[PDB]
Design a protein around this ligand. Structure first.
Ligand SMILES: *[C@@H]1O[C@H](CO)[C@@H](O[C@@H]2O[C@H](CO)[C@@H](O[C@@H]3O[C@H](CO[C@H]4O[C@H](CO)[C@@H](O)[C@H](O)[C@@H]4O)[C@@H](O)[C@H](O[C@H]4O[C@H](CO)[C@@H](O)[C@H](O[C@H]5O[C@H](CO)[C@@H](O)[C@H](O)[C@@H]5O)[C@@H]4O)[C@@H]3O)[C@H](O)[C@H]2NC(C)=O)[C@H](O)[C@H]1NC(C)=O
Lengths: 33, 225
């Protein structure tokens, strides 16, 4: 799940908002159903 | 003993050093229905003639202690923390459930030194039960224990939504194909539910009504010994 970061050095990262999107995708969708 | 009100002249102690437990744990006080179910289940395993309460207690009072210990260990091996053997209401020594009883705020200068350890898992509390069960070799019945523990995570009465929230927050997706990470997550959930957080809540509820000093510690996990 690699993504570029538009910083001064332009580095590479792997997780974008993993906790927040795991909340908004796994938990709260099951709670919605 | 901290919860129970007493005449001030006959106060049995002055301070309290509780290392790794609290009255505000959900498994601290057992309701009447669960206790009677435990008694009749132990009656069924010992094969007492279950007719009345006096009859079953009279049958149970004559059995040897080794047989009763073996039967209670066999039943407790596949039972949740809410199905343990604990204190009941009794109406005389205790009056009300512990959270309500803590709000009287009548104690007379009782200090408190309370704390925990990072390796005080509730699964780790049942090592001897596991060793006895593996000594008999009863199919290595640990998935029943883990299922009952996961159901016990859902409050007193097993409710679906608290179970879903608990399985989300800690990473115990029900992947029993690898028991290492799931078992560690189950220890994590039971330790944070039954041990750490009631200790913190009791320390808060004792320090808030300022009539005694409260000190709290926490021991990190010690590898070895
Ligand atoms: C049961 O309970 C146990 C506690 O008794 C848990 O053990 C502990 O779990 C926590 C979970 O958060 C661990 O905390 C992490 O510690 C890392 C320390 O760095 C190094 O150590 C790790 C090994 O212990 C190693 O895997 C790491 O990769 C690292 O080499 C922190 O880095 C880590 O930070 C997280 O949160 C930060 C919040 O801002 C975030 O910045 C971090 O960034 C990383 O990920 C983001 C994406 O989110 C990327 O963009 C970054 O590039 C970077 O890769 C990261 O998200 C976190 O705080 C703790 O180490 C662990 N052990 C101990 C001894 O405390 C168990 O996990 C519990 N569960 C089970 C099943 O047992």
């Amino acid at each position: 799940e690699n993504y570029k970061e538009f910083s001064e050095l332009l580095p590479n990262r792997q997780g974008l908002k993993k906790a927040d999107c795991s909340f908004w995708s796994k938990y709260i969708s099951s709670l919605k159903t | 003993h901290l919860l129970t009100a007493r005449a001030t002249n006959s106060q049995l102690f002055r301070r309290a050093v509780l290392m790794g437990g609290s009255a505000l744990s959900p498994a601290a006080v057992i309701s009447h229905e669960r206790a009677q179910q435990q008694a009749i289940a132990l009656a069924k395993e010992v094969s007492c003639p279950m007719s009345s309460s006096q009859e079953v207690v009279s049958c149970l009072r004559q059995k040897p202690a080794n047989v009763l210990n073996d039967a209670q260990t066999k039943l407790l091996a596949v039972s949740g923390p809410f199905h343990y053997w604990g204190p009941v209401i009794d109406g005389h020594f205790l009056r009300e459930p512990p959270a309500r009883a803590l709000k009287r705020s009548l104690w007379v200068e009782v200090d408190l030194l309370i704390g925990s350890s990072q390796d005080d898992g509730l699964i780790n509390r049942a090592k001897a039960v596991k060793q006895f069960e593996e000594s008999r070799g009863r199919t290595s019945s640990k998935t029943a224990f883990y299922q009952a523990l996961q159901n016990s995570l859902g409050g007193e009465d097993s409710d679906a939504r608290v179970e879903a929230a608990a399985t989300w927050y800690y990473s115990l997706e029900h992947s029993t194909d690898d028991y290492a990470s799931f078992s560690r997550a189950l220890e994590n959930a039971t330790r944070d539910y039954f041990i750490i957080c009631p200790i913190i809540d009791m320390a808060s509820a004792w320090a808030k009504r300022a009539r005694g000093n409260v000190f709290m510690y926490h021991a990190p996990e010690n590898y070895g010994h």
